[PDB]
A paper describes a structure:
We have described functional and structural studies involving a toxin isolated from Bothrops moojeni venom, MjTX-II, and the inhibitor Varespladib. On the other hand, Lys49-PLA2-like myotoxins share the same general scaffold as Asp49-PLA2s, but display myotoxicity in the absence of catalysis. A hypothesis on the mechanism of myotoxicity induced by Lys49-PLA2-like toxins was recently presented, and involves several steps. It is proposed that initiation occurs by the binding of a fatty acid into the hydrophobic channel of the toxin, followed by allosteric activation and alignment of functional sites.
The crystal structure of the complex MjTX-II/Varespladib reveals the presence of inhibitor molecules in the hydrophobic channel of the toxin, interacting particularly with His48 and Lys49 residues. The structural importance of these residues was also observed by MD simulation, in which they were found to interact with the ligand during almost the whole time. Therefore, binding of Varespladib into the toxin’s hydrophobic channel is likely to prevent the membrane’s fatty acids binding and, consequently, precludes the structural alignment of the functional MDoS and MDiS regions, resulting in reduction of toxicity. Another structural feature observed was the particular dimeric assembly of MjTX-II/Varespladib when compared to other PLA2-like toxins. On the other hand, Varespladib maintains strong interactions with the same regions (Helix-I: Leu2, Leu5, Gly6 and Ile9 residues; MDiS: Leu122 and Phe126 residues; and residues His48 and Lys49), as observed in the crystal structure and MD simulations, occupying the hydrophobic channel internally. The interaction of Varespladib with residues of the hydrophobic channel forces MDiS to remain in contact with the toxin, favoring the distorted conformation. In the present work, MD simulation of the MjTX-II/Varespladib complex showed high stability and affinity of the inhibitor in the binding site on hydrophobic channel, which suggests that Varespladib prevents the interaction of fatty acids with the toxin by competitive inhibition, and also preserves the distorted structure of the toxin. In the present study, functional assays performed in mice and in cell culture demonstrated that Varespladib interacts with MjTX-II leading to a significant inhibition of its myotoxic and cytotoxic effects.
Residue numbers in the entry:
A (entry chain B), B (entry chain A): 1 to 13, 15 to 53, 57 to 61, 67 to 90, 92 to 123, 125 to 133
């Protein structure tokens, strides 16, 4: 679900998910994928490519369970579709955390998103 | 295409179309439709509904020709899909101009688009 994804991004990056990443670059938030603009954008590219491989579940709405073992996000069992989905959300939240220092606020509100260059079908 | 649409919006409103409207409200720019926030937003809602009926061409990518008869945008060669595409774009550019008196910069970069209340069927 969008609300579990936002929780993980807030806990991993310390930033508000919607404001800092909701319109970021060519891949983060609304819209689809495009030529990634930096490391942070590449994370959202892989995450959207991750979402594309889910067959029988709705990433935006279908909820899932997850827990925290020390600093590690643990995805609880709940069908392979929701497991991979939690693993997609864990992946992007860790990814955004790992590349915080290359975050660039000049791509935060990318109002040229539809004019991004084409990308590959994942 | 988006190139002709942006040209119309610039000519009618005098504003940078991508910066001013690319992420505006719940309906303008990248993303889908949602509960409109104001009159400018409702222009984009109507325009997206207009695009929905163009099942025979690509509204974002397919180029077309237009010109001006005095102060009225005149859409050219009646290729059925491309003619109606041009008319969709002319309608929103005039709608945006006529509603500049309530344009709200607070909605310009709506990073909360995915949390907009769902819209009615077109
Ligand atoms: C990176 C943050 C992100 C997405 C990403 O992680 C991303 N890959 O862009 C994403 C998104 O992507 C999934 C998809 O397109 O279906 C769709 C919509 C919003 C999206 N926010 C912003 C957000 C997430 C959670 C709570 C509040 C705001
Ligand atoms: C309101 C302006 C607008 C769209 C609208 O007119 C609107 N109805 O939102 C729209 C758009 O809409 C079509 C759709 O979503 O399929 C999609 C993508 C960008 C869109 N920009 C911004 C823009 C348009 C043209 C040139 C440069 C920027």
């Amino acid at each position: 679900s969008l609300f579990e994804l936002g929780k993980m991004i807030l806990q991993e990056t310390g930033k508000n998910p919607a404001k800092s990443y909701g319109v970021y670059g060519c891949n983060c938030g609304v819209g689809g994928r495009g030529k990634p603009k930096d490391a942070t954008d590449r994370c959202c590219y892989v995450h959207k490519c991750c979402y594309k491989k889910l067959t029988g579940c709705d990433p935006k709405k279908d909820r899932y369970s997850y827990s925290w073992k020390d600093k590690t996000i643990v995805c609880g069992e709940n069908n392979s579709c929701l497991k991979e989905l939690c693993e997609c959300d864990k992946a992007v939240a860790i990814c955004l955390r790992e590349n915080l220092d290359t975050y660039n606020k000049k791509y935060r509100y990318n109002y040229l998103k539809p004019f991004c260059k084409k990308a590959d079908p994942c």
